[PDB]
Nucleic acid binder design. Structure first.
Ligand SMILES: [Mg+2]
Ligand SMILES: [Mg+2]
Ligand SMILES: [Mg+2]
Ligand SMILES: [Mg+2]
Ligand SMILES: [Mg+2]
Ligand SMILES: [Mg+2]
Ligand SMILES: [Mg+2]
Ligand SMILES: [Mg+2]
Ligand SMILES: [Mg+2]
Ligand SMILES: [Mg+2]
Lengths: 109, 216
RNA sequence: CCGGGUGUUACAGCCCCGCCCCGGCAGCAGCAGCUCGCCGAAUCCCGGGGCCGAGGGAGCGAGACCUGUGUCGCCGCGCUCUCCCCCCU
RNA sequence: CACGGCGCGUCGCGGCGCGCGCGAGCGAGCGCACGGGGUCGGCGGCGAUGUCGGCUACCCACCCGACCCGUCUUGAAACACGGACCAAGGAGU
RNA sequence: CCCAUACCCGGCCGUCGCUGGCAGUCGGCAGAGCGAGAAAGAGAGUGGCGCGGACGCUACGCCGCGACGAGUAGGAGGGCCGCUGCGGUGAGCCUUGAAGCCUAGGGCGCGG
RNA sequence: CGGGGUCCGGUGCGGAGAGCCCUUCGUCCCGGGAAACGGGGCGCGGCCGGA
């Protein structure tokens, strides 16, 4: 009935100043702003959900316009709650500053 | 011959015994345990008798074949894997299903099954979930428990019972088992005030609350 | 109550110094979970997250009286070929 | 306690060390594994005119990177020189 | 706390080294080893039923271990890269369609 | 009614954004608590409220 995930923003790729590695993304999870608070989210699955034009099949339902790129949280980043994430395919650059759902079912509690 | 005795040393740590070699030589009493030095069947036929050879040669060898594999030791089939359970999960605990069709429904937990799946049920009279299996990873175990140490669940229910077959029709055996379990579960949860409504409700996340902050 | 002055334990305290068993008692690099160290043949246990799984005929025992098998080498163990006793189903 | 037989025991210092014989250097099975590189004797869904797969290649978008080549030169993106574009010919015999 | 093509661990390609290993496919005519700390014989001798057992080995081949890989001028090697003609060879192809040319099609090779 | 005076309360801000509000499985019976002034109505016709 309600919402079962947590908001994150796809801030950007793991990068230096002149090089960027697109195989690792940086997520800003809402509400967590320090390293001693990000150990909860380590290993949780994350999803980038977006609409498209063509219909695609969905598990346990009729086809619709929704598509998803899956991934998982790997490790903390920085000192301010930033999180490193790895997805099965590198996220498109058009998702910079957009919503990624981090879920809870890879649970350890 | 000889009855198989148990191991003479308790496991101190995995792979290390409590007693040393000499202590074992003493405890086993080995000082007085010294020791010193198909493919054919004959059948009658109505002629005479024929020596039929079972395990006969194949009538077709393939163009080419793969070689054998090297031997490895630490790999075991899923049947005899050691089963682990989270410390926070004990019989009579409330869980929150996170991924099934019953998303975020508070459900009572009863028993760990043989293959590692949790046998779970919140009495479908109030939260509408039957006897079911659920993976222990995909559930949140809150720190609210009831006492179900004094309830009996049938021994016939198991993973073979819950295994999918093949439209799915519920069986009368399923109905009677669910009734038998819930007739004992329900009075226990009705003793605790405001617990039936809690199980009826559905967990959700609103803005301003974060799982890493909130405790359960 | 405050300010100034005198002064040497008074209606507060502080520092040093012989001994009383270095007076005695805990305790001790202290979860009074930060008062200050260097370590571990004087060190072990448990747990969590991430990435990967390349290689593919290793042999065992059977004895010229047999011809099987594919859980094998090194390493660490347990049980039996001795006899009793205890506990739980 | 990586101690475990009997002897002849000096193979010996006073017993321990440490030698000589004992069908003569042959006890066997099962089982578990922190043991010469992964397996499952574990599972779940969706599939006929709208859906599944197609790295690359066609077009488009985004983030990062990114100065036009050849040549002589210590130094070329150069306010150094040759070069509008395309086809064929073209130089260690 | 952040990250380089640096360092550590793993996979893959190639080069170099071990001037490494394999002719032992020794089968009812046989007995399946030469990885095991110690230069050298699983040494030869004379006296007190069921007929059965994968792959290999273009030796210019196959297989195993380590280390390493920048490059102008220049040197060398390999090209089952390419073009034209000649001697051989493919009981080669082809009017049931060759050469050539075009392609939003399917692929191979690090590359030609 | 607004602005001042006294006085009384709070002040690591409990008249707090480190907070507040709404909170959703649904339906059926009977009982208690709150309400009888309440709830719902392009169901209504007006009156003000805004540059
Ligand atoms: Mg730029
Ligand atoms: Mg020039
Ligand atoms: Mg020069
Ligand atoms: Mg000029
Ligand atoms: Mg000139
Ligand atoms: Mg010009
Ligand atoms: Mg030309
Ligand atoms: Mg390496
Ligand atoms: Mg080079
Ligand atoms: Mg074209």
């Amino acid at each position: 009935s309600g919402r079962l995930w947590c908001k994150a923003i796809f801030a950007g790729y793991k990068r230096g100043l002149r090089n960027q590695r697109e195989h690792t993304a940086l997520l800003k999870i809402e509400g967590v702003y320090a390293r001693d608070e990000t150990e909860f989210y380590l290993g949780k699955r994350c999803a980038y959900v977006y609409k498209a034009k063509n219909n695609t099949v969905t598990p346990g339902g009729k086809p619709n316009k929704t598509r998803v790129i899956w991934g998982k949280v790997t490790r903390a980043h920085g000192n301010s709650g930033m999180v490193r994430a790895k997805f099965r395919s590198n996220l498109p650059a058009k998702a910079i500053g957009h919503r990624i759902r981090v879920m809870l079912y890879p649970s350890r509690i | 011959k000889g009855k198989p005795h148990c191991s003479r040393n308790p496991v101190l740590v995995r792979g290390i015994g409590r007693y040393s070699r000499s202590a074992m030589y003493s405890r086993k009493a080995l000082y007085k345990r010294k020791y010193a030095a198909l493919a054919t069947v004959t059948k009658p036929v109505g002629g005479g008798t024929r020596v039929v050879k079972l395990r006969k040669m194949p009538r077709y060898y393939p163009t080419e074949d793969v070689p054998r594999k090297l031997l490895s030791h630490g790999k075991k089939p899923f049947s005899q894997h050691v089963r682990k359970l989270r410390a926070s999960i004990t019989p009579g605990t409330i869980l929150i299903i996170l991924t099934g069709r019953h998303r975020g429904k508070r459900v009572v937990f009863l028993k760990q099954l043989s293959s590692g799946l949790l046998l779970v049920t919140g009495p479908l009279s109030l939260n509408r979930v039957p006897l079911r299996r659920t993976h222990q990873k995909f559930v949140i175990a809150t720190s609210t428990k009831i006492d179900i140490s004094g309830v009996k669940i049938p021994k016939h229910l198991t993973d073979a019972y819950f295994k999918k077959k093949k439209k799915y029709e519920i069986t009368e055996q399923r109905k009677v088992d669910q009734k038998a379990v819930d007739s004992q579960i329900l009075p226990k949860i009705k003793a605790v005030p405001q617990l039936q409504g809690y199980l009826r409700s559905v967990f959700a996340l609103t803005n301003g609350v974060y799982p890493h902050k909130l405790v359960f």
